[PDB]
Amino acid sequence: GGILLVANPVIPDVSVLISGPPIKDPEALLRYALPIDNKAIREVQKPLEDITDSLKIAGVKALDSVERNVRQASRTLQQGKSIIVAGFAESKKDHGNEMIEKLEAGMQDMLKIVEDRKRDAVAPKQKEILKYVGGIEEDMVDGFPYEVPEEYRNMPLLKGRASVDMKVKIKDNPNIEDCVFRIVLDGYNAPVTAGNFVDLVERHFYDGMEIQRSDGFVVQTGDPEGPAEGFIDPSTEKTRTVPLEIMVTGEKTPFYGSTLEELGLYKAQVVIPFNAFGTMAMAREEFENDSGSSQVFWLLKESELTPSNSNILDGRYAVFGYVTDNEDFLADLKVGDVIESIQVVSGLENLANPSY
């Protein structure tokens, strides 16, 4: 599946590569991380993506689902005035239309599969066309940085996006001696953590380093919402009884576990540098002492968040990088393998307050 770069500020310089089945599609993740406020283009974007669910259907029926998603996206598009005017921006309004144009032709190509079957050799044409959607959106709200920092206003900051090529030397393997991975870093949402990583790439901090690999768990913590659009008449006002209950029909009643996944815990590959252990024991307690029962000591848990965390020690990470190429060869990384080099490929200008 998808592939990730995670970090904990105040605890910097050790950044974690997490990859595996539970990790969502890199490109989709970046698209949703763009600091744009345009419901119209998100509406075109939502289907187009659900097309992948449509392919989870067996038989010709999958196609009468993607045809559904395409006509959906296509329709909502004809509304290119809120996409075009409302949000397109300065110097990109031209390439933006270059993108809208290609999206329309691609949607027509997707349609041309009235040739029921051809369910392979044209379906992920879905990739092609979503890039054009990504492009529409990146061309939209530009202007770089939606907001700004707190106290770290003097540490490196990635006031944008940047790309990096990571060339790894993979040992003892017939079929592959080495691979190059492309990672995009998201400074719109992870200014501090992305800033630090590129800053360290610059001082060649990752070249010739060896890695450790292993398994960990990802608290892909909790996600979707509620509201549906299009205002009509009156139906609500009052909190009512949410107090005395055990609440509604198919929505609540006491916990429920059985496998780690059922508790929101998904297994993923975890690759780091190869280091040591450093401690700083404190906080607010008095719930300690003794023995009698517990313990063995293993498997790290990773809470995934947007930089919305503060001070002192442990628990929690912010997501800042996304592996967008050769994401399938990460599974071939073992302890002992070498990061030969990590070189910025684009976006270096977005780096402010560089130190190196």
Cα 138 to the center of its chain, rounded Å: 16
Cα–Cα distance, 151 to 350 (Å, whole number): 19
Measured distance CA(314)–CA(286) in Å, rounded: 18
Token pair of 294, please? 């517990």
- Which candidate, 129, 137, 135, 1, places its Cα nearest to that of 69? 129
**Residue 37 and residue 140: Cα distance in Å, rounded?**
9
Contact 65, 112 (CB under 8 A): no
Domains and CATH numbers, the chain: 1-35+143-356 (no CATH), 36-142 (1.20.120.290)
Tell me how far CA of residue 215 lies from CA of 291, 301, 326, 334, in angstroms: 28, 10, 20, 11
The tokens for 36 are 């744009």
**DSSP structure string for 38-81:** -HHHHHHHHHHHTHHHHTTS-STTTHHHHHHHHHHHHHHHS-HH
Which one-letter amino acid corresponds to residue 35?
P
In 3D space, the residue among 96, 317, 354 whose CA is nearest the CA of residue 200 turns out to be 354
Half-sphere exposure of 229 (CA within 13 A, CB side): 4
DSSP conformation letters of 251-316 = S--S---SSTGGGT-EEEEEEE----------SS-------SS-------EEEEE-S---SSS-S-
User: Which residues are within 8 A (CB) of 34 and not within 5 positions of it... i.e. 6 or more apart?
Assistant: 137, 138, 140, 141, 188
Cα 342 to its chain centre, rounded Å, is 20
| Way the structure was solved | X-ray
List CB contacts of 112: < 8 A, sequence separation 6 or more: 122
**Could you tell me the two tokens for 286?**
């008095």
* Token output for 47: 């289907």
Partners of 94 in the β-ladder: none
DSSP track, 172-206? S-SS-SEEEEEEEEETTT-HHHHHHHHHHHHTTTT
Strands 351-352 and 157-158: antiparallel
Q: Dump the DSSP string for 107-159.
A: HHHHH---SS---SSSGGGHHHHHHHHHHHHHHSS-SS-SS--SS-TTS-EE-
This structure's resolution (angstroms)?
Answer: 2.4
